[PDB]
Design a protein around this nucleic acid. Structure first.
Length: 48
DNA sequence: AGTAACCAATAAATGGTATTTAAAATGCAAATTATCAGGCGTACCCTCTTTGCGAATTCGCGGCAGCGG
């Protein structure tokens, strides 16, 4: 657990970029960001 | 080119009380097809950056605030 936190906290900027590419008047910025963070947690789980 | 209402008679005058008839039709609940609605996955590399620009030169008033003897 304490290992995965490090990658998750490292790649938040990546999430920000991908999200802002979709922000143009959808839900709201922060909702997109948080949903992307869910996705990032999934990806960290699946990466080899 | 013929009177009767005499007293029986005849069943026809009804519109009313029902267990039937089974055929129909009318509904009823299954089988059995189509199609819709969810979940998962994607391996070159990409890393705070977008915003609101201002419910828009109001104004007058009040009061709850920080500095200050």
């Amino acid at each position: 657990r304490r290992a995965k936190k490090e990658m998750v906290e490292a790649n938040l900027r990546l999430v920000i970029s991908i999200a802002k590419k979709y922000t143009n008047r959808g839900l709201q910025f922060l909702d997109l960001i948080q949903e992307g963070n869910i996705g990032l947690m999934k990806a960290v789980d699946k990466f080899e």
